[PDB]
Amino acid sequence: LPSSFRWSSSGPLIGPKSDSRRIQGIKDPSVVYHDGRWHVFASTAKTEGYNLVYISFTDWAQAGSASFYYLDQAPLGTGYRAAPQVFYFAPQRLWYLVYQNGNAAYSTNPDINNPAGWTAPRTFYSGMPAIIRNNIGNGHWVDMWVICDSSLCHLFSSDDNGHLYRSQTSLSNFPNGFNEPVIAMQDSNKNRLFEAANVYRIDGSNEYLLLHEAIGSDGRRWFRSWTSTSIAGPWRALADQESNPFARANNVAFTGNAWTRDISHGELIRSGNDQTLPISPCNLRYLYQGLDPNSGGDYNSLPWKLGLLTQTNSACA
Ligand SMILES: [Ca+2]
Ligand SMILES: [Pb+2]
Incomplete structure (x- = not known):
């Protein structure tokens, strides 16, 4: 894995459908390739609220035409849900979908190809942990991310106030037993460490990669x-x-x-x-959200669309 990056971006690949839901942004994607198809989970966003959608397609050229399965039709249900993370928790032979609902939440499903099967939400904590309540400022508890190694599971989250939190539990007890979070990273300028963590195992190394969104000196996300x-x-x-x-x-x-x-x-x-969230150090590809730079107005109404970055300074195949 190199210490600098260059990318080539697609155009916008996935945006909202033109249906009565009048969704304004498609956001916060999670993605796996399984049995010959891409499986994308994303937030639906509008002034009125957030929920989750499942999108599947064989080829990136067909992503835009792929049907949506609105997950509020599953037991996952209506109400606020946002910012999903999908992975297969191999010891239980169950897929997990991690997201926020006001708490750190999850659904399970034995079959990723059955979007109707996602369970009604359960939570990883009984309420917002004290350390998060104490340090959140007027932020928001968001962007829940699980990664496990051979013995522990870790649950990361952000507060839109410059703190990245991390709890852990044993692999055998997951999803139960997450402890009080510690502050894994912080910045006195919340814009430098804002939200949307990713944490991955780097294949072929004994190392992990942390990505985190920031709001730069030009006001733009990076x-x-x-x-x-x-x-x-x-x-x-x-x-x-x-x-x-x-x-x-x-x-x-x-x-x-x-x-x-x-x-x-x-x-x-x-x-x-699987639950180890591995990446290859070669040919990195980042599925992300972008928007027209002339977009303004209320944050929840912004016209976010998904695109794909392909690394152009790749170290390997
Ligand atoms: Ca995410
Ligand atoms: Pb946000």
Whole structure:
């Protein structure tokens, strides 16, 4: 894995359907390739609220025409749900879908191909942990992310106030037993460490990759990156500056026209679908949300669409 990045971006691939839901943004994607298809979970966003959608397609050229399965039709149900993470928890032979509902929440499903099967929400904690209540400011508890190694499971989350939190539990007790979070990383400037963590095992190394969204000096979204030998840190900067970013307008080429100046809440294409959240260090691809740089108005109404970054300074195949 290199210490600087360059990318080529697609155009917008996935946006809202034109249906009575009048969804304004498709956001916060999670993605796995399984049995010959892409499986994308995303937030639906509008002024009125958030819920989740499942999208599947064989080929990236067909992503835009893929049908939506609105997950409020499953037991997962209506109400607020946002920012999903899908993975297969191999010891239980169950897929998990992690998201926020005001708490840190999850659904399960034995079959990712059955969107109707996602369970009604359960939570990882009984309420907002004290350390998060104490430090959240007037932020929001968001962007729940699980990664496990051979003995522990970790649950990361953000507060939109410059703190990244981490709880852990044993692999055998998951999803129960998550302890009081510690502050895994923090910045006194919330914009430098804002939301939307990703944490991955880097295949072929004894290292982990942390990505985290920031709001830059130009007001635009971008990603910083760090690595560590442990999921518990300490984290060392990889590409974490505006002049050496993980992903930002200044290291993203477009084959077509530049349709976004923001590189926001995304996920890397993984090398496997299990609870270890592995990536290959080769040919990185980042499924992300962007929007027209002339967009304004209320945050929840912004016209976010999903695109795909393909690494152009790849170290390998
Ligand atoms: Ca996410
Ligand atoms: Pb946000």
